[PDB]
Amino acid sequence: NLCPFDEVFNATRFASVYAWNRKRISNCVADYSVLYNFAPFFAFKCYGVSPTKLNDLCFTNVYADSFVIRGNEVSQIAPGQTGNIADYNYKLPDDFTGCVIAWNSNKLDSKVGGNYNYRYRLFRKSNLKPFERDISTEIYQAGNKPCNGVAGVNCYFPLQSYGFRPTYGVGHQPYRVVVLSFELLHAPATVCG
């Protein structure tokens, strides 16, 4: 009766930090025996709940949010932390209880031709509200028109590639990150064991 968390982390299809991937877990027995106890995990940390207590902790629903970021930016996924990825791309609330996990994917997702298929966000008009999916295809600009009729000036496109390739140092090796959010409102809590 175990939840599909196993697949969630091992599906090795993670999309982008741009329009991250989500799953709404419910009605199962969350083991955790592997969670934060498997070997190649690099960083795992939760606020408000201890891991083992969590393993005995129980909730109403679950939200899993997987994405891919650059290694030097994992420190920006934190409550109210400020930077680029945590201000215009994906921003977690201030009272977020739960844990994040990050793996140095310096081998699984990189190609000499440039595993830059994903285009992260670099131009946004205003800061993000917590958990606000903002996948969009527009032209950030300065003057009257967007790049559809202008070029050079006012011709910006927020989706910029990463360009992950093996010569890159650790600070630029793609870290895969997965964040778990336990909701406790009206909880005919259906998940502990």
Epitope: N72, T82, N84, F157, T167
Partner: antibody, heavy 118, light 109 residues
Framework: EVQLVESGGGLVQPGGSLRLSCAAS????????MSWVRQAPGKGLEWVSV???????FYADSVKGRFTISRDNSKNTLYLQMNSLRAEDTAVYYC????????????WGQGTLVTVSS | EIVMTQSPATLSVSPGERATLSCRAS??????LAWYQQKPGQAPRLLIY???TRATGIPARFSGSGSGTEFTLTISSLQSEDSAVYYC???????????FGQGTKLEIK
């Protein structure tokens, strides 16, 4: 023409305060990553501060805790308050709009000298 | 904090020939770089951004190359006005970060 013009440059006694201001034209600043740079007489350059398009600003470590960037968006302008100017901070300050991987810093300011009593 | 080192410090070449300036990084800067030409008396001017992409307008006489920790700028035919100072700026950390070089003074004859 597209430009950044500066003001506030001058002389002030150590420990005193000062405020540099930057006005722009044919280009917006509120939605433009702005960056103040400085240059000591005869030396290289060093990034001093940056303000984003959402307001979350950042400063270098050498001047961390003492300088504060702000901007009157209503009339398209930037500002940088400095205080407790010590012997090091005598330099010429430049205003800049950096794009990065999509065009590296390009539009800059005429500059503004900031020296101290001695 | 990546420390950049330019070379050589000074250069005096006869008019009309080629010129070669090296800028050396201390870590992996991949192809994230730029070159500024600050003619003495006003603000710098961007010449070449990214790895070797020539900024708009910038005369084709300039050419950038290199990758990783070592980069080079090359000038085809120095004209009388090319005498100026040049700086290589790296930006592997973009929001908020930049790290400059020591600059190079280029003159003619």
């Amino acid at each position: 023409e597209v430009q950044l013009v500066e003001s506030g440059g001058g002389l002030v006694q150590p420990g005193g305060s000062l405020r540099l201001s930057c006005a722009a034209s044919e280009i917006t600043v509120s939605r433009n990553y702005m960056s103040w740079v400085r240059q000591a007489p005869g030396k290289g350059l060093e990034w001093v501060s940056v303000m984003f398009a959402g307001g979350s600003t950042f400063y270098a470590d050498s001047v961390k805790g003492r300088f504060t960037i702000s901007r009157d968006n209503s009339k398209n302008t930037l500002y940088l308050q400095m205080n407790s100017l010590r012997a090091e901070d005598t330099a010429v300050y430049y205003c800049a709009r950096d794009l990065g991987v999509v065009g590296a810093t390009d539009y800059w300011g005429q500059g503004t000298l900031v020296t101290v009593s001695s | 904090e990546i420390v950049m080192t330019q070379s050589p410090a000074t250069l005096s070449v006869s008019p009309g020939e080629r010129a070669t300036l090296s800028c050396r990084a201390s870590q992996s800067v991949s192809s994230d770089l730029a070159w500024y030409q600050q003619k003495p008396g006003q603000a710098p001017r961007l010449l070449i951004y990214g790895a070797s992409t020539r900024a708009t307008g910038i005369p084709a006489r300039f050419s950038g190359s290199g990758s990783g920790t070592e980069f080079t700028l090359t000038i085809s035919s120095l004209q009388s006005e090319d005498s100026a100072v040049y700086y290589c700026q790296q930006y592997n950390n973009w929001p908020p970060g930049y790290t400059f070089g020591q600059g190079t003074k280029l003159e003619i004859k």
